[PDB]
Enzyme design. Sequence first.
Site, PDB file in Angstrom:
ATOM      1  N   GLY A  31     -29.389 -20.225  47.489  1.00  0.00           N
ATOM      2  CA  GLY A  31     -28.900 -19.299  46.530  1.00  0.00           C
ATOM      3  C   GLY A  31     -29.549 -19.453  45.153  1.00  0.00           C
ATOM      4  O   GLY A  31     -29.419 -18.303  44.783  1.00  0.00           O
ATOM      5  N   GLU A  41     -17.228 -15.150  39.764  1.00  0.00           N
ATOM      6  CA  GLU A  41     -15.959 -15.266  39.871  1.00  0.00           C
ATOM      7  C   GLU A  41     -15.651 -16.877  40.293  1.00  0.00           C
ATOM      8  O   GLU A  41     -16.157 -17.269  41.387  1.00  0.00           O
ATOM      9  CB  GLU A  41     -15.327 -14.679  41.346  1.00  0.00           C
ATOM     10  CG  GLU A  41     -15.147 -13.107  40.934  1.00  0.00           C
ATOM     11  CD  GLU A  41     -13.866 -12.636  40.425  1.00  0.00           C
ATOM     12  OE1 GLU A  41     -12.913 -13.382  40.196  1.00  0.00           O
ATOM     13  OE2 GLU A  41     -13.719 -11.468  40.039  1.00  0.00           O
ATOM     14  N   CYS A  81      -8.662 -20.416  44.172  1.00  0.00           N
ATOM     15  CA  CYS A  81      -9.230 -20.434  42.674  1.00  0.00           C
ATOM     16  C   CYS A  81      -7.867 -20.137  41.629  1.00  0.00           C
ATOM     17  O   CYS A  81      -8.048 -20.852  40.770  1.00  0.00           O
ATOM     18  CB  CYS A  81     -10.493 -19.471  42.549  1.00  0.00           C
ATOM     19  SG  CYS A  81     -11.666 -19.786  43.730  1.00  0.00           S
TER      20      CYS A  81
END
Lengths: 476, 476
Positions: free
Chosen positions: B211, B249, B282
């Site tokens: 990542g 996000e 979330c």
Amino acid sequence: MLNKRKFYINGLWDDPSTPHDLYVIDPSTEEACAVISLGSTRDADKAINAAKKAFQTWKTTSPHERLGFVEKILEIYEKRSSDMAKTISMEMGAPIDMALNAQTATGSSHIRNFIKAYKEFSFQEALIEGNEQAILHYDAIGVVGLITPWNWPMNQVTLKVIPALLAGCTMVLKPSEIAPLSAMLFAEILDEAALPSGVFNLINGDGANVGSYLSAHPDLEMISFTGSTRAGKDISKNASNTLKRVCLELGGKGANIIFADADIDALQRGVRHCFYNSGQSCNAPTRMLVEQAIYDKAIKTAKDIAEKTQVGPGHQTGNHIGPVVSKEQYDKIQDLIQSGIDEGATLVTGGTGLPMGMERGYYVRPTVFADVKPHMRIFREEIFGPVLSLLPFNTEDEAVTLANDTEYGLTNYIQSQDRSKCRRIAAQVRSGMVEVNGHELPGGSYFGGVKFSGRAREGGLWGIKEFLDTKAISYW
Amino acid sequence: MLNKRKFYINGLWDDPSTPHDLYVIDPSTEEACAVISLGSTRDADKAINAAKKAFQTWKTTSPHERLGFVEKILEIYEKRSSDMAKTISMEMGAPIDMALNAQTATGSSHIRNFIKAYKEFSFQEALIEGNEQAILHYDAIGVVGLITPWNWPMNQVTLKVIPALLAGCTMVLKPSEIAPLSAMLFAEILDEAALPSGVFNLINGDGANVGSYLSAHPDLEMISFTGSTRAGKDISKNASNTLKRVCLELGGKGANIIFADADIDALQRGVRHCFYNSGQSCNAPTRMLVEQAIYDKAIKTAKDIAEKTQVGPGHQTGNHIGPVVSKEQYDKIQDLIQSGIDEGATLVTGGTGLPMGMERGYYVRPTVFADVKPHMRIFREEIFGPVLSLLPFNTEDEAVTLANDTEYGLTNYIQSQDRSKCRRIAAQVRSGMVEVNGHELPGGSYFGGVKFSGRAREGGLWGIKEFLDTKAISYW
Ligand code: NA
Ligand code: NA
């Protein structure tokens, strides 16, 4: 010498926490014209505290009242325009005619274009066309950090402070420490406009201390930065721990693609544009890519225009170019010019050293290189002096490849009387802006780039929106 | 146990450079359901090289042909929908009914909403309304990095891959290593759709290695990331040295402001929404702020709904909640529940430990706290389990202050039958989204937040544009 040590915080000019004097140099003479203070982190905290407190009431002013302040700012800006021109000329070397008609006038033009845009903008609108239930709301992003450079100071300050005002934000501006006086006068303009205490705050300082400290400060929700690509990366790194919005206007290495069928004046226009503001324009067309058939003509035209481009002090009227802004800038440019010679580019005219007759000041000779190759430093690096690089191309693909061989992408330029060819090439070059056949972008258009030039979209409606968050309400 | 060690690179399923096995755990049982490979930087370079090469030809496909691929993807997605539901249920614990009707169906809904948006979008338009000279052009941003989490996997994957396709980008997706199987099946969908080799690539891996390596890679021009706020800060830090566009996000701590005049079902709707997907959303409404007059009623209603909320395995039909996704998540939630007890909040129902009768699996008890105070961990930290916090307010200002006492700002919620009051409160809360009176945002609206929730704008037209650069051409 001007005593300019104070900061503008919460409606008042006040002393810094601790003296840290810096002379502002007039680059036309090499002499100090003023003294300013380099602020500390404590001065920054003060400025930011003043802005946070003001925001609570400034965010509730109506658009009508905010526009009225901006109109008042414009009125006082125009009243002080020749003070502004002289200040800019003195601190960064702009020849006085262009200090008034371009350095200062672009400020007023940006202000007017924000006014026009604001009148078309609404803080609420439909979320989806034809749905009358859900609504889109725009909210002031919050307290913001503004950092501006020395090369087009009022252009860059007006592009940031005006849309932040209109959006309902409060702000701390740190201008360039080598050309801060214009910003300080802008501060006086805002003070005379009776902008409420703490809405706008100005502290002087450097990048490594105050600039970095603003970009990392937890009470700022956004940083708007115009400057070098190197600095923009560090701003972005410092801002990431508080997830600020980061808007960057960085450098460029513009290609100017000139076809054999370009209009008569294309070549002259191009060379002149390269030397304007002594090359100290992030979007200047510094790589001239010329169709093989007119390459010899291009070299000859660049030579003539260069030899006819006069150099002179900021304080003199006329259309000569001025000095570059600093010793450090002068030394970087000399090194890059010398690199062009050493790497084997053809030196067409100009070169290293002061132009003949100049005894002092950071005067760079208008310089042209030809037969420049992609690996050369002068092809790759932003020079920020009056230094043009020419090379030929044979096919449309070759021109596009050369134009796109860069990490930058601010403004690219295309000259051809074949509209179809203009369109093909414009679609393939990788930049935020493309100027075709000497046509400027219209008032209210954005200014900004892609990739290493940054992705900020300053000016008009784009610029107002960079200072707003969007909010989607499911039933209004 | 499923053998799922391969990566999808350049149109083919291939072995990683070096084995680095990781079991995917079924959280309903604590048993391994598959084995995958954690990729290295070499596997990333391969994937990115495949994407860079594909981009040269994929960027020249017409919008018509790209839409045709997306329609084909939807057709195959629907054909494989119950394979997708079972895969999601197994790997992250979603009860199978909601695994089909929400986890999988939101994927198809996003795809359709991108299709509708694309049909309204044009890659060229006027730069300024009424100027027929200058033009705005949208260009594929380039080769992009996509990183998705485990909680709503197909929701999050479709929100990224579809607009990147339509925009003309190529991409490398790294899904969540604790729920990668759904993404791998999505890969098979795209392969069956005959998407050209290298346009879409999937490598598995973790945040700290793959990542981070994607976010810093010089051949990616953008990173789209959905995940924790902590991870988003590091993505942003790593990306800053190449000045990538970064779209985030992140997490949330949604306030649900319920007035005494809310509709009959407001309280039930709120509590149910908190426990849905076992709280692993979330934007879940996790702080219920209740007007004093109905506070006792709120506590009593939350208690009833909690006690009636069943817990059970992913593989069983019905409307129970499933386990949370992992041991590490379970341990974090237990710690936060224990903190609520220790800090002196009122434990209304639920608490620590497995629900009675469950011997294994990461089952968290539906839990309600009341008299929660702003300093408590359960008020401030995103819990991501079925854990609701209640507290009262007395005035509109107090409700707004409490709702805004957070660094997050994803979705806030307001329940009142007074439309004026809804409007006042909606305008004052600081979030990217506001859902009023149980009304969802319409299809084609964006999804995204402000501040520590990130500022990404996924979905519909907003989402397509995050994968485009703008170019302003002065004469077209
Ligand atoms: Na100076
Ligand atoms: Na799992």
